[PDB]
mmCIF file of C-alpha atoms in Angstrom:
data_model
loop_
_atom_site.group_PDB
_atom_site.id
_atom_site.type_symbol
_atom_site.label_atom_id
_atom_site.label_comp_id
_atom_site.label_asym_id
_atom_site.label_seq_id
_atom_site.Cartn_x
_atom_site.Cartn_y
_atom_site.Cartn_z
ATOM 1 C CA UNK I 395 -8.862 53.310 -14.319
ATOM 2 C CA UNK I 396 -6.884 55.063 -11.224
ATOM 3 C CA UNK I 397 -9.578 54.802 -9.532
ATOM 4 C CA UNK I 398 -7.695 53.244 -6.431
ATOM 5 C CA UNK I 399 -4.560 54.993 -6.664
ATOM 6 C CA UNK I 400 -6.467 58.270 -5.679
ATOM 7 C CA UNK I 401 -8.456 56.646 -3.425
ATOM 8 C CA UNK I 402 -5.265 55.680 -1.775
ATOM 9 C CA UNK I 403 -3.558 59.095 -2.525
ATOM 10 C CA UNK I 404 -6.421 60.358 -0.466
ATOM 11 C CA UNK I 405 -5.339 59.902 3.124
ATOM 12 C CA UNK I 406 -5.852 62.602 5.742
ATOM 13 C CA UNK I 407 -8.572 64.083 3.594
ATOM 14 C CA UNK I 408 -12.015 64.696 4.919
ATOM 15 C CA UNK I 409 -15.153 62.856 3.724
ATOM 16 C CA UNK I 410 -18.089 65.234 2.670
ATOM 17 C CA UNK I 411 -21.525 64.580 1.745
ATOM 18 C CA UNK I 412 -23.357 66.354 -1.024
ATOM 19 C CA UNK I 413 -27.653 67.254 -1.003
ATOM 20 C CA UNK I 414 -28.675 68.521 -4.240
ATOM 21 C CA UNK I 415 -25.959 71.413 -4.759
ATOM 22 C CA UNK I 416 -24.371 72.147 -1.637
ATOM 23 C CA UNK I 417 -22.013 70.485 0.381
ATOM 24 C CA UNK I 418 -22.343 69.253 4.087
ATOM 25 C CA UNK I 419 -19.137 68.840 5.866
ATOM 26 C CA UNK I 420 -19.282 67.292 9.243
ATOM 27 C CA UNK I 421 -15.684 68.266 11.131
ATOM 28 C CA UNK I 422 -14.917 71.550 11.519
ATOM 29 C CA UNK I 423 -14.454 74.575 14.356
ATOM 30 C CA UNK I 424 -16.676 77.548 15.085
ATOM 31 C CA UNK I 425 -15.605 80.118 17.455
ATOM 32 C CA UNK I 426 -18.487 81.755 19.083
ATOM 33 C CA UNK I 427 -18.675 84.468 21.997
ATOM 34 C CA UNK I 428 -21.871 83.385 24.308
ATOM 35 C CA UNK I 429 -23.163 86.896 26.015
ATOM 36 C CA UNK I 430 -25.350 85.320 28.745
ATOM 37 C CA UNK I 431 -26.764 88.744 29.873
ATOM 38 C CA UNK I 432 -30.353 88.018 29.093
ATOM 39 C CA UNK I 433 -30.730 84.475 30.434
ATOM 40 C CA UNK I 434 -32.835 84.375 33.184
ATOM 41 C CA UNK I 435 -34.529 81.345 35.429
ATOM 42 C CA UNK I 436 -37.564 80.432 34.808
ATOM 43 C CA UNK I 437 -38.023 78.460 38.320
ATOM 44 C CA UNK I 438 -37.768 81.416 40.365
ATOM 45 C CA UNK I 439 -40.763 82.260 42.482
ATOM 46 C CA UNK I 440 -42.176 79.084 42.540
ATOM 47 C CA UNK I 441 -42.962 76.879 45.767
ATOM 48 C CA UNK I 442 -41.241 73.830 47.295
ATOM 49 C CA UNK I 443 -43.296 70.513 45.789
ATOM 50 C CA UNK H 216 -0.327 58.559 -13.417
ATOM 51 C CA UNK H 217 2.647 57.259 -11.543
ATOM 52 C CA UNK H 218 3.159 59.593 -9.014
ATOM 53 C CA UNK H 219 0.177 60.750 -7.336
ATOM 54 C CA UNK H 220 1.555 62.399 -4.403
ATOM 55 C CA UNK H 221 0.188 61.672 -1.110
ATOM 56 C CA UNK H 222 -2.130 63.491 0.880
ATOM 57 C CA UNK H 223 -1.134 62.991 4.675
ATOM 58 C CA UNK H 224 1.619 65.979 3.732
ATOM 59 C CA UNK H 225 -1.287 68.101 4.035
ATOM 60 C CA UNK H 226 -3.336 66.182 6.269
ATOM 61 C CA UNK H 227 -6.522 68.081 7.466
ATOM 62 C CA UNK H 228 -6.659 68.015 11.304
ATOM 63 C CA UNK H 229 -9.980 67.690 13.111
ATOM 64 C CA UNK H 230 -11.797 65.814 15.456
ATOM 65 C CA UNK H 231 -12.760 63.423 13.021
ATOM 66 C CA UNK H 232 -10.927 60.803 11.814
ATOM 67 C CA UNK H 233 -9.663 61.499 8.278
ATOM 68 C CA UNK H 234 -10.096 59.003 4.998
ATOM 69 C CA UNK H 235 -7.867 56.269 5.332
ATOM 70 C CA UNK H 236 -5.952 56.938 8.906
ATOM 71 C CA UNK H 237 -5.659 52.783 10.197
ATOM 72 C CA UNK H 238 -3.514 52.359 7.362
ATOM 73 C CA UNK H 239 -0.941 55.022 7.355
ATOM 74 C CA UNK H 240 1.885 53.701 9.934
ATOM 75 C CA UNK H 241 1.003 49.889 8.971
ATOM 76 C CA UNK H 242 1.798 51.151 5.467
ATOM 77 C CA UNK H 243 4.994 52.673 5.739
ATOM 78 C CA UNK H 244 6.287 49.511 8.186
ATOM 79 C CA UNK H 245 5.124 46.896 5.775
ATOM 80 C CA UNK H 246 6.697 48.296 2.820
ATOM 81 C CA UNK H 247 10.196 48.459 4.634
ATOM 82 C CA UNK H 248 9.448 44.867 6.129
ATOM 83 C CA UNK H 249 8.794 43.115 3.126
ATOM 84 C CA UNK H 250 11.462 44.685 0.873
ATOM 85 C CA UNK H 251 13.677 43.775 3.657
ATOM 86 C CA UNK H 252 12.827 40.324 4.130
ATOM 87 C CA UNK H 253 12.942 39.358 0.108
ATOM 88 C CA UNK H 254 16.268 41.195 -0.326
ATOM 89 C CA UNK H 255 18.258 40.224 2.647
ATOM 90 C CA UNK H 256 21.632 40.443 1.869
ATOM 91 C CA UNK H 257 21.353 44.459 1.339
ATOM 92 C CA UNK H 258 21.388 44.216 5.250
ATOM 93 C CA UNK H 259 24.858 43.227 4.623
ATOM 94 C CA UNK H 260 25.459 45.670 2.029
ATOM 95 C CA UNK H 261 23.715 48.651 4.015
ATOM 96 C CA UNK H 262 26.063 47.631 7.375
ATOM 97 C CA UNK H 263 29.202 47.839 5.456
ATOM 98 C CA UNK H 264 28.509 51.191 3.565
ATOM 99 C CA UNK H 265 27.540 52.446 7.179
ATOM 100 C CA UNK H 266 31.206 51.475 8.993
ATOM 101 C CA UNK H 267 32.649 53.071 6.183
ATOM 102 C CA UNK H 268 30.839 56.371 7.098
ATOM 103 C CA UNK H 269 30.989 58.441 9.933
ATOM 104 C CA UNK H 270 33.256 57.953 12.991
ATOM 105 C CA UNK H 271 31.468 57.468 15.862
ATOM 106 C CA UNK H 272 29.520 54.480 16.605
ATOM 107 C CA UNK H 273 25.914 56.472 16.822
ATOM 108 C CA UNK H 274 27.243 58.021 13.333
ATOM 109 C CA UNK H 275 27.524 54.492 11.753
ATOM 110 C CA UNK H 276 24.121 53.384 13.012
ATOM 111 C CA UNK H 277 22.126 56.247 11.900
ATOM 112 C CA UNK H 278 23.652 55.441 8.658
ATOM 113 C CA UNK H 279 22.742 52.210 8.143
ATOM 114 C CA UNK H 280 19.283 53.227 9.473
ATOM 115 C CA UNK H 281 18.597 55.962 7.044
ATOM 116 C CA UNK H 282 20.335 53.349 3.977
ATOM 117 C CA UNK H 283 17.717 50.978 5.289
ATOM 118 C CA UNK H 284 15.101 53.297 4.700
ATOM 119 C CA UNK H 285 16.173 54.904 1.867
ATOM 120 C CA UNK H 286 16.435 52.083 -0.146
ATOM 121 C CA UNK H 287 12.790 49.760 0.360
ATOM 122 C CA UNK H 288 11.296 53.427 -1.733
ATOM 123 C CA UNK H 289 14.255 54.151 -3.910
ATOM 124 C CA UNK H 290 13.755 57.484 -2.735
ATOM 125 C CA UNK C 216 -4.371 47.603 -0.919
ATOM 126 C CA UNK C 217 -2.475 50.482 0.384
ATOM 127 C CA UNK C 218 1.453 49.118 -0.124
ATOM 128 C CA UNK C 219 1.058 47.078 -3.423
ATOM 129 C CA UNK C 220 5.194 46.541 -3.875
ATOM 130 C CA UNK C 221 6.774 47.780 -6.903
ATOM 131 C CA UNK C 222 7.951 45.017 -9.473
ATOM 132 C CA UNK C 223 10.956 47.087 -10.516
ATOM 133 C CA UNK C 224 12.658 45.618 -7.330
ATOM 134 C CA UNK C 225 12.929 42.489 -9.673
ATOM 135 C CA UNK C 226 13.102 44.080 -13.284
ATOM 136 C CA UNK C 227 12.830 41.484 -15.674
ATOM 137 C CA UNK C 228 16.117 42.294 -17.753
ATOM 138 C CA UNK C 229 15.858 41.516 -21.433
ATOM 139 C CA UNK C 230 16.720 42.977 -24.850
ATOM 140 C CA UNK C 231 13.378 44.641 -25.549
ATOM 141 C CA UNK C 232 11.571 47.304 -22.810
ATOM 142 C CA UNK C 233 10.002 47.038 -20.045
ATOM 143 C CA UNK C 234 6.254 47.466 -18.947
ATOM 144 C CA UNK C 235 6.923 51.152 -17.986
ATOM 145 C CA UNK C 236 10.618 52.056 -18.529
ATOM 146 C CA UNK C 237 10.304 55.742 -19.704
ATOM 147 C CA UNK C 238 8.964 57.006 -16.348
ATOM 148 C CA UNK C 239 11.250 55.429 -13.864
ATOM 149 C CA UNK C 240 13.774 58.381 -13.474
ATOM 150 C CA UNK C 241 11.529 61.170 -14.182
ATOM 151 C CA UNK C 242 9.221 59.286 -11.849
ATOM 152 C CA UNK C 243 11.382 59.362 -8.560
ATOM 153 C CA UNK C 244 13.177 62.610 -9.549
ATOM 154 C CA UNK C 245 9.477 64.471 -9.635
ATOM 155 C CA UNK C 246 8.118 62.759 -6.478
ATOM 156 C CA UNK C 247 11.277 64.529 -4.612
ATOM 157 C CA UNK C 248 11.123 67.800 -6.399
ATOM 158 C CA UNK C 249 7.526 68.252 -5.839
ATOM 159 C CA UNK C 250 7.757 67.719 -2.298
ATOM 160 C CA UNK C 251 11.061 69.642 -1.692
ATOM 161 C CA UNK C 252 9.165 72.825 -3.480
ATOM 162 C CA UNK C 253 5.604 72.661 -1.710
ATOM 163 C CA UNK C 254 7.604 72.385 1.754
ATOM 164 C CA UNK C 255 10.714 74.770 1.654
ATOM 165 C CA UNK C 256 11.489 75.380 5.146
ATOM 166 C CA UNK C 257 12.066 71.471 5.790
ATOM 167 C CA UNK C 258 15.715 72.559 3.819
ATOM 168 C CA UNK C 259 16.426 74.411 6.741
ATOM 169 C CA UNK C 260 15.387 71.986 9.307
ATOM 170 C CA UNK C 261 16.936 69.054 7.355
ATOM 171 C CA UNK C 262 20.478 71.126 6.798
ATOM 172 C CA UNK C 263 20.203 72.008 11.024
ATOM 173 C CA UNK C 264 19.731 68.565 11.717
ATOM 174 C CA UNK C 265 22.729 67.407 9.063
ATOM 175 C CA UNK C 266 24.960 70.226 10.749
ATOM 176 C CA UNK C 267 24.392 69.156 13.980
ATOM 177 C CA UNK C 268 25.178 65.265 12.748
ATOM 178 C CA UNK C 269 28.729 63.946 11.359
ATOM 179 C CA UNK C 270 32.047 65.144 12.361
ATOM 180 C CA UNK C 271 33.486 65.786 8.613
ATOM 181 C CA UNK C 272 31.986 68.180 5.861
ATOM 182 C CA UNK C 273 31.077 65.376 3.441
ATOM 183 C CA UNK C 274 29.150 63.604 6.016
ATOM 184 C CA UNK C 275 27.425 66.478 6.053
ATOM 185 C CA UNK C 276 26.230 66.998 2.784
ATOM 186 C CA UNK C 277 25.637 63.096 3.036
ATOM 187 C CA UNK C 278 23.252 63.325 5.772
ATOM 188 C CA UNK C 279 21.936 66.168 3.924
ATOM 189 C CA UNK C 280 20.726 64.761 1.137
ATOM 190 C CA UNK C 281 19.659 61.364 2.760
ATOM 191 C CA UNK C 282 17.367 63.425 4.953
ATOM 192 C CA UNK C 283 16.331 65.325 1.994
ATOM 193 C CA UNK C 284 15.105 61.969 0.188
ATOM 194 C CA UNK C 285 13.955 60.079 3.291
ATOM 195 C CA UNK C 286 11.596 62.990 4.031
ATOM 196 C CA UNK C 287 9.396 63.114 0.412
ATOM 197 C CA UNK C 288 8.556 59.570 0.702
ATOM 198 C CA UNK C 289 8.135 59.133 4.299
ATOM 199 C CA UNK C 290 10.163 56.156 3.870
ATOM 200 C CA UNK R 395 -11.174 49.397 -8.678
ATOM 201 C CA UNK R 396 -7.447 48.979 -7.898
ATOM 202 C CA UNK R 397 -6.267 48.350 -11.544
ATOM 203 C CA UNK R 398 -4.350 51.696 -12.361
ATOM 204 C CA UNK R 399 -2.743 50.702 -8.951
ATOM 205 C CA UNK R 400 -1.703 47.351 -10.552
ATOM 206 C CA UNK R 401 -0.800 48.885 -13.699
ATOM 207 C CA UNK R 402 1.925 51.337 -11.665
ATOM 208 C CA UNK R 403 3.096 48.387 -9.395
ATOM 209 C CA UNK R 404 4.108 46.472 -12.740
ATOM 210 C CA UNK R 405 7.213 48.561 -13.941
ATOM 211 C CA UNK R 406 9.793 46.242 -15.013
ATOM 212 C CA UNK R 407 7.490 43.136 -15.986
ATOM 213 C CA UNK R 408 7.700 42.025 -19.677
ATOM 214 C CA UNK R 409 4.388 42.497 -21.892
ATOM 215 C CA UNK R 410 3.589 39.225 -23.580
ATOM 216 C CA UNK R 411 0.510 38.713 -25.932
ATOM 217 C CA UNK R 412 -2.215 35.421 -25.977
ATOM 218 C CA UNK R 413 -3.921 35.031 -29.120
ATOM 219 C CA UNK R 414 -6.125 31.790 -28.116
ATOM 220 C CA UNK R 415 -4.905 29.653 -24.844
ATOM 221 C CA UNK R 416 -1.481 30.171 -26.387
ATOM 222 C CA UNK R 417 0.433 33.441 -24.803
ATOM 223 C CA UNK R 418 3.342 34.433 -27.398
ATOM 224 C CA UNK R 419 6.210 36.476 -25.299
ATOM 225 C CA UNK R 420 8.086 39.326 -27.335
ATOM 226 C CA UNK R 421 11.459 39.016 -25.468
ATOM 227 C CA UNK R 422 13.580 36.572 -23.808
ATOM 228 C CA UNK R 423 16.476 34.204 -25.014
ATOM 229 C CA UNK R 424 18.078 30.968 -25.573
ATOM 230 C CA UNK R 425 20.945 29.417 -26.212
ATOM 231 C CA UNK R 426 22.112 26.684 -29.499
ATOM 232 C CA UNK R 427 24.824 25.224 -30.243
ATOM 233 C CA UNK R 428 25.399 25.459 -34.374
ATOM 234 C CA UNK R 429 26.524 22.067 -35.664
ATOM 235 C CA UNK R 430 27.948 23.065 -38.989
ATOM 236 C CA UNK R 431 29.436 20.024 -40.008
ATOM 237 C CA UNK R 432 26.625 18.817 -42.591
ATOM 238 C CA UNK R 433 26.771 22.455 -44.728
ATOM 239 C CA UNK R 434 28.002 22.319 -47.651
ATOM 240 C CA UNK R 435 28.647 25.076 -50.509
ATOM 241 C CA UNK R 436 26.103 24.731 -53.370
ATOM 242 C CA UNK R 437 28.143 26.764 -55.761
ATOM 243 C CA UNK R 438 31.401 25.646 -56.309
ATOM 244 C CA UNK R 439 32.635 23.605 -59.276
ATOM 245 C CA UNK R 440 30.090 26.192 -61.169
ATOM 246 C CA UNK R 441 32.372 28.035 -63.845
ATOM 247 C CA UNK R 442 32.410 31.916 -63.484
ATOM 248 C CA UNK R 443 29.769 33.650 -65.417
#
């Protein structure tokens, strides 16, 4: 049954979970640029409480 | 089958902690401990093949250190 | 478990075979070769390292190749 | 389910076979001493044929 040979053989490999047919993965890295050039502050112009 | 090679070769590195990784050095040490301790007298065996190597004295112990280890897998 | 020692350590020795006899050599000789050819550039680092060990040639090939088997099974 | 594990870790340990509480082994060995000293030749004094 080898069923715990690969289960062993699997070490340093990532878990995954599967909903319906696609696969969520939950370690990874994005790489995103963040262009804060249209951020403003909504508080500004209000008065001291 | 029989060999099944292992996966921390190409372990994936992340922030998360991979499948099995509190078992990996504990493995490897108690493998070489416990073929050591039931065959004992190889320690002899290992120390004389390992004077008969090598000059130095640094020589001569990394011998017997890589005999030790080499033999507990039969590598 | 994760270790689960071999029992060819203490090969029963008899007329007829043993539980798995066919597979023994092919067994450790295909565990090295696999490894040796998915990671190439570990010859080079292991023949550096023997180079820069041992005083002789012979000791060099020796470290050599007990580097090159101590390395595919992590022993 | 740790069996094909098992089945690896046992190279080098002798198959037997149990037909009822009684396991049979198919290799081992003993030692006898042959006392041949009550054998006897059933043929001779027979005239040749």
């Amino acid at each position: 049954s080898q069923e715990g040979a690969v289960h062993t053989a699997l070490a340093g490999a990532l878990e995954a979970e599967m909903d319906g047919a696609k696969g969520r993965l939950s370690s990874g890295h994005l790489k995103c640029r963040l262009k804060m050039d249209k951020l403003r502050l909504k508080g500004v112009s209000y008065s001291l409480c | 089958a029989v060999t099944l090679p292992s996966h921390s070769t190409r372990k994936l590195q992340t922030r998360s902690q991979t499948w099995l990784e509190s078992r990996e050095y504990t493995k490897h040490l108690i493998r070489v401990e416990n073929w050591i301790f039931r065959n004992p007298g190889f320690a002899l065996a290992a120390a004389a093949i390992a004077w008969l190597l090598g000059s130095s004295t640094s020589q001569k112990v990394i011998y017997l250190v890589m005999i030790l280890l080499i033999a507990p897998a039969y590598s």
